Design a binder for this molecule. Structure first.
Ligand SMILES: *[C@@H]1O[C@H](CO)[C@@H](O[C@@H]2O[C@H](CO)[C@@H](O)[C@H](O)[C@H]2NC(C)=O)[C@H](O)[C@H]1NC(C)=O
Ligand SMILES: *[C@@H]1O[C@H](CO)[C@@H](O[C@@H]2O[C@H](CO)[C@@H](O)[C@H](O)[C@H]2NC(C)=O)[C@H](O)[C@H]1NC(C)=O
Ligand SMILES: *[C@@H]1O[C@H](CO)[C@@H](O[C@@H]2O[C@H](CO)[C@@H](O)[C@H](O)[C@H]2NC(C)=O)[C@H](O)[C@H]1NC(C)=O
Ligand SMILES: *[C@@H]1O[C@H](CO)[C@@H](O[C@@H]2O[C@H](CO)[C@@H](O)[C@H](O)[C@H]2NC(C)=O)[C@H](O)[C@H]1NC(C)=O
Ligand SMILES: *[C@@H]1O[C@H](CO)[C@@H](O[C@@H]2O[C@H](CO)[C@@H](O)[C@H](O)[C@H]2NC(C)=O)[C@H](O)[C@H]1NC(C)=O
Ligand SMILES: *[C@@H]1O[C@H](CO)[C@@H](O[C@@H]2O[C@H](CO)[C@@H](O)[C@H](O)[C@H]2NC(C)=O)[C@H](O)[C@H]1NC(C)=O
Ligand SMILES: *[C@@H]1O[C@H](CO)[C@@H](O[C@@H]2O[C@H](CO)[C@@H](O)[C@H](O)[C@H]2NC(C)=O)[C@H](O)[C@H]1NC(C)=O
Ligand SMILES: *[C@@H]1O[C@H](CO)[C@@H](O)[C@H](O)[C@H]1NC(C)=O
Ligand SMILES: *[C@@H]1O[C@H](CO)[C@@H](O)[C@H](O)[C@H]1NC(C)=O
Ligand SMILES: *[C@@H]1O[C@H](CO)[C@@H](O)[C@H](O)[C@H]1NC(C)=O
Ligand SMILES: *[C@@H]1O[C@H](CO)[C@@H](O)[C@H](O)[C@H]1NC(C)=O
Ligand SMILES: *[C@@H]1O[C@H](CO)[C@@H](O)[C@H](O)[C@H]1NC(C)=O
Ligand SMILES: *[C@@H]1O[C@H](CO)[C@@H](O)[C@H](O)[C@H]1NC(C)=O
Ligand SMILES: *[C@@H]1O[C@H](CO)[C@@H](O)[C@H](O)[C@H]1NC(C)=O
Ligand SMILES: *[C@@H]1O[C@H](CO)[C@@H](O)[C@H](O)[C@H]1NC(C)=O
Ligand SMILES: *[C@@H]1O[C@H](CO)[C@@H](O)[C@H](O)[C@H]1NC(C)=O
Ligand SMILES: *[C@@H]1O[C@H](CO)[C@@H](O)[C@H](O)[C@H]1NC(C)=O
Ligand SMILES: *[C@@H]1O[C@H](CO)[C@@H](O)[C@H](O)[C@H]1NC(C)=O
Ligand SMILES: *[C@@H]1O[C@H](CO)[C@@H](O)[C@H](O)[C@H]1NC(C)=O
Ligand SMILES: *[C@@H]1O[C@H](CO)[C@@H](O)[C@H](O)[C@H]1NC(C)=O
Ligand SMILES: *[C@@H]1O[C@H](CO)[C@@H](O)[C@H](O)[C@H]1NC(C)=O
Lengths: 414, 414, 414, 414
């Protein structure tokens, strides 16, 4: 009785066009998921910034944040197991949510991801009651609920996939023991029973569905677990009609490893598809006050690939979120959705598109494919993702690379 | 002793800027080579169009081709061996000079490159007496001597490199036997002594020099021989200051196979060098009345990586040649140069930069490295090649990609 | 619902020690597999010698072959498709069984492996109904059932792996078309799913299992398929406790190509494992009346590495089979088992250990790894193979390399 | 006017059979070389123990070393430049010869080979006045003159070979500057002009002669320098009649590394030659009280390939130097010769046969080919080396691998 529902977070003061597709809000989904929890809650997060005073700002947009924190506290008051895995080189170093939760009774382990592979634990997912899971780009932060546009997937009553994700969470947990090292071969406990060529077949609300989970980096991939890079490559290469993708930040270079090197894999896979198979490739990126201006030339090259007379169609746009009054809060008002949708499959990832995210930085992602079933009224997951992507593109917040009119709130040329 | 002098052909009515560097004319070098011939002449060519009537055009510019054919016939009259290897799917269908030479007593073999690897014999080199060797992007054609602009290299009196290229020609020759098949392995008699790791060593006019030869496709590459792709990639990677390249066509895809596919090897190498190593990259391409307009989008994409702030600098310009009154002569008034210049190497080759030239189509490439010697007067071959490239780059006939203007001679999309 | 059961055949007049481990007889498994067939039977074989008179000798041991042929004819009677792939240079020329089945309605095709890759089709496997497979060294011959020691593996109700093997069978079938050549690249039809990197996960009778296949020569290996030599090297390298191997022929040299060469790849792998990793290595070799006496120098050289003090233990034994009153049967009374078992994987192949078997002839392999299940169940396939190897090793028919008894049977020094 | 002289040192109490061939004594050649030099002397050595008190032993066999040290001091008196390159982790640590020479005025520079490449400076050669050279296995030790059997080569009045060895010694000296690292690419001068494909031709005493130098490790090989491993492989492969080799120790493994690995390159080359070419392969490994007993299994494995019926001859023996009354002297009474003999060439090296000497430990080697001249009076160098090897082989001091008589003063089993 697996149930899959798309979930996303719309930032404050970001009205959409009339009659536009939409999914369930993120805060309501998280609150309901935590309410339905009865045995244990496992969460892997990059950082915790649930309350406003953690950052140091005084705003009314963190109400959902401390509501979530007090919900966590009252859940801990009901004698429910709670495990948190977080990266040792955390982001918000002034927050006290982890200490408060640990004092209340939860167990928190800091994964030394920066020492093991010179990276960070970017994975963000939940495993609630060993039956319900959440997967998406959102972080444990009020900004991700009210300021940053998110997109994720939450699954209910799907024990097999829940245990599949729990295996990865257990790898993270056992890596969090003090003075731990990477096992050469992972034991026969973390091996995944579902992968790219043997997906989990099920009937999601009477609709056939094939799903599997991808993990990264390769050093943390147990036997039988498909890597994130190969899942992405398979999704892109299996395309026959179009490839609609949207990431917060994308360029074919290594960022935090010196010396910098070219990483042309995802770009080559895009150009090869768009040329050989003639698939309409559309790419969305996020532009904000913290955006690196050096990213744009690569996007301009990809746009320059376009040639309608030769059946090569590549289009690249950027996403602008108007800051408006919300200028005091840092690292907000950014399109943080990371996913692509094909006419066949639908990939919902966590990591960005760079060498480090697929070689050094821990990540996770899931691929689903809902073939049409016995209910003509029902719409498949890929159709919903495509509708959301088209709503994003048709919105006035998406500006082409050529358009650099004043008033846009991002660095642009820089 | 080895001598090395660059040779290039300047088309009629194509004056250069005052004070520009020059080189030895191609026709004079060919006549000198034929005059110095005393034992045997081995020629590997794509097609033969020496006479004006062979094409069918009544023009006075073919007088030099007539003189060259007369010199060849005179050489054949002095009991001098002349072996010619040509591709089976030739181009000048209506040519009769080869038949005349065969009647005079020359040995000609039609290499069945079409039925062997689905390609052609694009290699255009020249071995005289086993000592003097010419190689460049110039076919045995009068328009290639007075109407088209190429650049080749002739090496005098120096026998070991001549023997190496003679081994390559012997592979081409043994492939010319009727009803011959591609050997699975090559005998020891076909094995190049010099490669990337162990290049030839010599003192060229009192100046130290290292050189070696490359061949393609890998099917016709015996043990020890370096592939053209390998040599090009090594030359690109070794460079740390600048990379100057001139080619008639630059297609990052296949050109004649079905279905077409992306081949980003050269593009990836160029981008990786220009980004990681901070190497200045300049690319010059040829324009003609018969040119595929789909090449331009890839050139624009490569040009788009032009952010000077991040130490990345790529520039692309096209090189046109005015038609003038020579509209009657077909497939002429184009830039035929095919070479790469770096600060430590100078690649001169006969193949274009598409996939088939390195996968199926036969070709030969020469990489020559020179260093400042004891003498303080002369300049290295790299310096001369760089000066010639700069002269072409600063010429009025070279315009930018966005330099489309009325009166040009490119196809220019459309 | 896959079920893997190890199968083997014990020759008559070859008693074993009391209480020795034993597996399912080969004849019963073959008869059951034929009986369960209802859609189609695909068999790839080296030669066909089902009937006793085909060889030319009458014996009571041919009754099993007669029964097998009768079963096959009965299957042909019930409108059951039967496709047969056989090498063009067959071994037993006097074989009327193939003609009988062709008259009855078979689809025998002669693969010209001799002309294509200068080899033979040594593959021996069945694909029954597209769900059940058989893999082993037993080519269909009454001598194999009654007079030759054999070992193989049969898998039931495992349709995915059956399709994976049907891919290789379809490769052989396509190569069997008259006037056919090796394609430069195999189509996407024949691309495999499971290799050493992503094996096939399954719960075989309540026990976790990972399995995949191999193919040879590399010319006939499509995309995504692991080479037989590569799989063998991976299995050898991964082993950390012991390596037990039993083959008919082990030659570190090319066996049929002229001029002879040295191919130390397998020998180097064995020595490197036994030295660097300190793994016990045991080698068992069948020794019939047709074995080449030049075998023994290499086996003695491998044995000479035995140094118990320096943690380098290598043992080699020779397994002879008594002849007795079965001398009239040619090409019989041998040990045809070709497999290697380690502490983490079990390899069952259909080819010997020589350069030709991995570069010129066609063969397939099967690598199975079983983990101890949660239930006690029985024993893993690796444990069963190890027990069989120990039973063979401790048998009186197995002798040391220096124990050449006068009353033995093999050629020994010749 | 180059002259090549083979020099060897027979230790005390080591008689030879009547009529045995012999060469010039090493000490006499060294004294003559030191006397001849009048401009500069360059030496490279593993260690410096020229006097008995350096080790701490009083014996009459140190008089030669003391006389050599006195000769060096006298040469320093005549104001002759003398440079020394030695490994930082030198074997002898209580010696004071280097300090005495430095106090006299000679420049001594330590080469930190143990830090740059985790190896030692095993090279042993001299360059006097840039016209005469010496290369052999003898160190700057009186034991190498009186208590160790040694072989070396001395070249007189040869400018070009002296210059090449001067380039090698100059690389060694440049590395010796304090706080230095391996240059990414060596400057122009360090490049060599003679390699295995372009040897230095000359009329050595009136007969034709081709020779070239080799160097190791690859980190210390400039452009145009043939790697000594490549030289060994070439002289082994080019063999067609016999391969006579004599080394102190022979391990197809890694001696000083962690974890140890199997290194079969030389073993594979020897076996491939002996099998494919049918070349009589002979080995002469030195044995002594300090010999590692773990080498013998590899020698037994090599010898077990012997098969006169199939034209394989891999006979292996061991050389034993009797201790006699010289038990007090440590690290002495061993065969330290390192050379290879062939009907074509004659390799002389300064390193044993192990992965360390070709991966990390530095070393040099000289390859000399002497074609027969017009005058048959002068025996070629290959003939002399073969005669010396035969004299050592047929001597009573050489014992087969099966001979383990108690009075043999060797380790054998241990
Ligand atoms: C997951 O399954 C459980 C049990 O099958 C569902 O819980 C039931 O939900 C229905 C619908 O509201 C109630 O009428 C039942 O009383 C519930 N039973 C129990 C034992 O809780 C649950 O709703 C399912 N999950 C989701 C998201 O629907
Ligand atoms: C771009 O794609 C279109 C769509 O296929 C091509 O137009 C025709 O498509 C049909 C589809 O059945 C083909 O049978 C035709 O061969 C296609 N061409 C023509 C001229 O009808 C179009 O040709 C493609 N563009 C290029 C440059 O090939
Ligand atoms: C190749 O070398 C020969 C001699 O080694 C050159 O011949 C000489 O050339 C010079 C200049 O052209 C003349 O002054 C001499 O009289 C020639 N001598 C002989 C014996 O021929 C020859 O020119 C060289 N090749 C080239 C192409 O220059
Ligand atoms: C399938 O099997 C049936 C028998 O079970 C075959 O039936 C016979 O066919 C022949 C003609 O080929 C008739 O003369 C017989 O009378 C049939 N026997 C029956 C109907 O019992 C049938 O031909 C087979 N299918 C084929 C080969 O097409
Ligand atoms: C493979 O699957 C078939 C069913 O498709 C199995 O056949 C059943 O086996 C059970 C247990 O022996 C019997 O109780 C049933 O009556 C069988 N049904 C049929 C229709 O035959 C079979 O046992 C499985 N294993 C094999 C063939 O090895
Ligand atoms: C052979 O291997 C065993 C273990 O694989 C080695 O035993 C170890 O020896 C070292 C030093 O002698 C001890 O520190 C370890 O505790 C031992 N381990 C075990 C499990 O016993 C043995 O030394 C090896 N033999 C040789 C000659 O190296
Ligand atoms: C082993 O070497 C011998 C040579 O001693 C080979 O004998 C050959 O006999 C044939 C018969 O006329 C002749 O070619 C020569 O007398 C020998 N050949 C050579 C090359 O010397 C014998 O054939 C060899 N055995 C092998 C290669 O298996
Ligand atoms: C935050 O702002 C509100 C509204 O002005 C104010 O009442 C409150 O005291 C502020 N809190 C802090 C900690 O500054
Ligand atoms: C939780 O457990 C404590 C003791 O461990 C107990 O006092 C308390 O009542 C429990 N609360 C719930 C909600 O189970
Ligand atoms: C693997 O899981 C089982 C329970 O399923 C447990 O008993 C065992 O200890 C686990 N292995 C490791 C290495 O933790
Ligand atoms: C932002 O500031 C403007 C100007 O005062 C105000 O009209 C608007 O309501 C503010 N937006 C908020 C408070 O969300
Ligand atoms: C070519 O043109 C010349 C004059 O331009 C003329 O004399 C000659 O006859 C022409 N020949 C041909 C074949 O057209
Ligand atoms: C050259 O060829 C001609 C024609 O076959 C012949 O007559 C002559 O003898 C040959 N040799 C010479 C001219 O030295
Ligand atoms: C090398 O061997 C081939 C093999 O037949 C032969 O055709 C060729 O002429 C030989 N080359 C020589 C001997 O230079
Ligand atoms: C790279 O660029 C930075 C500033 O953009 C500059 O400081 C630096 O010198 C550049 N690198 C080199 C090698 O010049
Ligand atoms: C073309 O012809 C015209 C008139 O005949 C002449 O003025 C011009 O110079 C010619 N151009 C060339 C390039 O010869
Ligand atoms: C084989 O069987 C018996 C031998 O026991 C013999 O009499 C018979 O004739 C033989 N059969 C054939 C078909 O040759
Ligand atoms: C090739 O693939 C097509 C489509 O999947 C299928 O219809 C056909 O039977 C396949 N042929 C072979 C030989 O596998
Ligand atoms: C071979 O002889 C044994 C006894 O020596 C006997 O049991 C067996 O039946 C004989 N073989 C045949 C085929 O009769
Ligand atoms: C021992 O050494 C002393 C010098 O310390 C020397 O005089 C004496 O001769 C030596 N004894 C020998 C060589 O037996
Ligand atoms: C060596 O140099 C010294 C420097 O003082 C000088 O006294 C001596 O005479 C020189 N010896 C020679 C030139 O032989």
């Amino acid at each position: 009785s697996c149930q899959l529902v798309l979930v996303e977070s719309i930032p404050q003061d970001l009205p959409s066009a009339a009659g536009s597709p939409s999914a369930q809000p993120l805060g309501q989904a998280w609150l309901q998921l935590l309410d339905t929890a009865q045995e244990s809650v496992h969460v892997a997060s990059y950082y915790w910034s649930l309350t406003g005073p953690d950052i140091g700002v005084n705003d009314s947009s963190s109400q959902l944040g401390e509501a979530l924190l007090q919900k966590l506290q009252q859940l801990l008051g009901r004698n429910i197991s709670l495990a948190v895995a977080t990266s040792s080189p955390t982001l918000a170093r002034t927050s006290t949510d982890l200490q408060v939760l640990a004092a209340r009774g939860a167990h928190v382990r800091q994964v030394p991801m920066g020492r093991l592979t010179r990276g960070v634990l970017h994975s963000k997912f939940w495993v609630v009651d060993g039956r319900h899971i959440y997967m998406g780009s959102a972080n444990m932060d009020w900004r991700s609920l009210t300021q940053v546009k998110e997109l994720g997937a939450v699954i209910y009553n799907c024990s097999h996939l829940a245990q599949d994700l729990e295996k990865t969470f257990q790898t993270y947990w056992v890596l969090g023991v003090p003075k731990a090292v990477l096992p050469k071969t992972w034991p026969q406990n973390f091996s995944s029973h579902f992968n790219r060529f043997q997906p989990f077949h099920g009937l999601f609300d009477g609709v056939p569905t094939t799903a599997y989970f991808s993990a990264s980096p390769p050093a943390l991939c147990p036997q039988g677990r498909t890597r994130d890079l190969e899942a992405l490559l398979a999704v892109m290469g299996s395309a026959q009609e179009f490839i609609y993708a949207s990431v917060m930040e994308y360029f074919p270079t290594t960022r935090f490893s010196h010396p910098p090197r070219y990483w042309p894999v995802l770009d080559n896979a895009l150009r090869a598809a768009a040329f050989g198979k003639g698939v309409r490739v559309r790419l969305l990126v996020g532009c904000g006050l913290n955006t690196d201006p050096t990213m744009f030339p690569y996007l301009r090259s990809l746009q320059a690939l376009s040639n309608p007379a030769a059946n090569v169609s590549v289009d690249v746009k950027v996403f602008i979120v108007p800051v408006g009054n919300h200028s005091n809060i840092p690292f907000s008002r950014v399109n943080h959705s990371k996913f692509m949708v094909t006419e066949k499959a639908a990939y919902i990832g966590t990591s960005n598109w760079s060498e480090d995210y697929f070689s050094s930085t821990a990540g996770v992602g899931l691929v689903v494919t809902q073939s049409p079933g016995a209910q003509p009224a029902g719409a498949t997951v890929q159709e919903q993702l495509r509708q959301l992507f088209e709503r994003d593109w048709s919105s006035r917040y998406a500006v082409g690379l050529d358009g650099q009119a004043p008033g846009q709130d991002c660095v642009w040329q820089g």
